[PDB]
Design a protein around this motif. Structure first.
Motif, short mmCIF file in Angstrom:
data_model
loop_
_atom_site.label_atom_id
_atom_site.label_comp_id
_atom_site.label_asym_id
_atom_site.label_seq_id
_atom_site.Cartn_x
_atom_site.Cartn_y
_atom_site.Cartn_z
N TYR A 180 1.35 4.22 2.84
CA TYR A 180 1.69 4.87 1.64
C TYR A 180 0.45 5.31 0.85
CZ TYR A 180 6.53 3.44 2.24
OH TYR A 180 8.09 3.32 2.75
N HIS B 119 0.42 -0.93 6.55
CA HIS B 119 1.17 -2.09 6.98
C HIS B 119 1.77 -1.89 8.25
CE1 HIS B 119 5.23 -4.35 6.47
NE2 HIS B 119 4.20 -5.34 6.69
N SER B 120 0.79 -2.38 9.12
CA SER B 120 1.09 -2.30 10.78
C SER B 120 1.38 -1.04 11.18
CB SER B 120 2.30 -3.18 11.00
OG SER B 120 2.49 -4.28 10.17
N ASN B 121 1.81 -0.04 10.52
CA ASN B 121 2.23 1.30 10.88
C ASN B 121 2.55 2.21 9.89
OD1 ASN B 121 3.49 3.79 12.42
ND2 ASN B 121 2.58 2.79 13.93
N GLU B 122 3.15 1.52 8.89
CA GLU B 122 3.61 2.09 7.46
C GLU B 122 2.16 2.56 6.98
OE1 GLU B 122 5.41 -0.73 5.00
OE2 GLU B 122 3.95 0.02 3.68
N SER C 78 7.98 -1.79 12.50
CA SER C 78 7.27 -1.38 11.45
C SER C 78 6.96 0.05 11.07
CB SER C 78 5.84 -2.21 11.34
OG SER C 78 5.71 -3.42 11.36
N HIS C 79 7.04 0.77 12.40
CA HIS C 79 6.95 2.38 12.17
C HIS C 79 8.43 2.87 11.83
CE1 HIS C 79 6.27 6.45 13.17
NE2 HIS C 79 7.05 6.60 13.96
N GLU D 281 5.26 -9.17 5.53
CA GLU D 281 6.32 -8.37 5.56
C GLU D 281 6.09 -7.45 4.34
OE1 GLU D 281 10.15 -10.25 5.52
OE2 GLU D 281 9.60 -11.18 7.28
N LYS D 282 7.28 -6.93 3.52
CA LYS D 282 7.07 -5.93 2.43
C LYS D 282 8.59 -5.93 1.79
CE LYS D 282 3.57 -2.47 1.55
NZ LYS D 282 3.11 -1.15 1.69
N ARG E 259 13.74 -2.44 5.29
CA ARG E 259 13.54 -1.33 5.89
C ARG E 259 12.30 -1.54 7.07
NH1 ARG E 259 8.15 0.82 4.28
NH2 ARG E 259 8.07 -0.78 5.85
N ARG E 260 12.89 -1.15 8.31
CA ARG E 260 11.79 -1.07 9.39
C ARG E 260 11.42 -2.65 9.71
NH1 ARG E 260 9.61 3.81 6.77
NH2 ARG E 260 7.38 3.23 7.50
#
Lengths: 24, 97
Positions: free
Chosen positions: B29, B24-27, A23-24, B94-95, A4-5
């Motif tokens: 939660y 996370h960089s931009n993400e 990442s966005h 990453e994730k 995801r992204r």
């Protein structure tokens, strides 16, 4: 790809010249 | 951007409206602070679980670098686990989602 992204929108992509969805 | 004097985020069983900003960089939660300690004061595995449960990502798959510490089961004393409303946490890498 199950990422995801990651790098691009969500798929592997062939161009990969726009980190808009890196990442966005 | 002083996420400290709030204490009004997401409330849970013991957690008195406390949620952390997992970036996370931009993400980003919203994850509830790990209780079972002292309400505003979380456990040592807090920063580790915060980022992990944030998206279901294993610790060795990320690199938490915030709260003045590093991701681990225990690093710096709980008193330094961000004595506020969760504080902020960020990981490099990453994730798995």
């Amino acid at each position: 790809r199950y990422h995801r992204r990651g790098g691009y929108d969500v798929e592997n992509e062939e161009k990969v010249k726009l980190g808009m969805t890196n990442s966005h | 951007m002083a996420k400290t004097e709030e204490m009004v985020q997401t409330e849970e069983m013991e957690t008195p409206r406390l949620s952390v900003i997992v970036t996370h960089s931009n993400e980003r939660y919203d994850l509830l602070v790990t209780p079972q300690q002292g309400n505003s004061e979380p456990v040592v595995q807090d920063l580790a679980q915060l980022v992990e449960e944030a998206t279901g990502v294993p610790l060795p798959f990320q690199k938490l670098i915030f709260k003045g510490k590093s991701l681990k089961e225990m690093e710096t004393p709980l008193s330094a686990l961000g004595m506020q409303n969760g504080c902020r946490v960020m990981l490099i890498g990453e994730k798995s989602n």
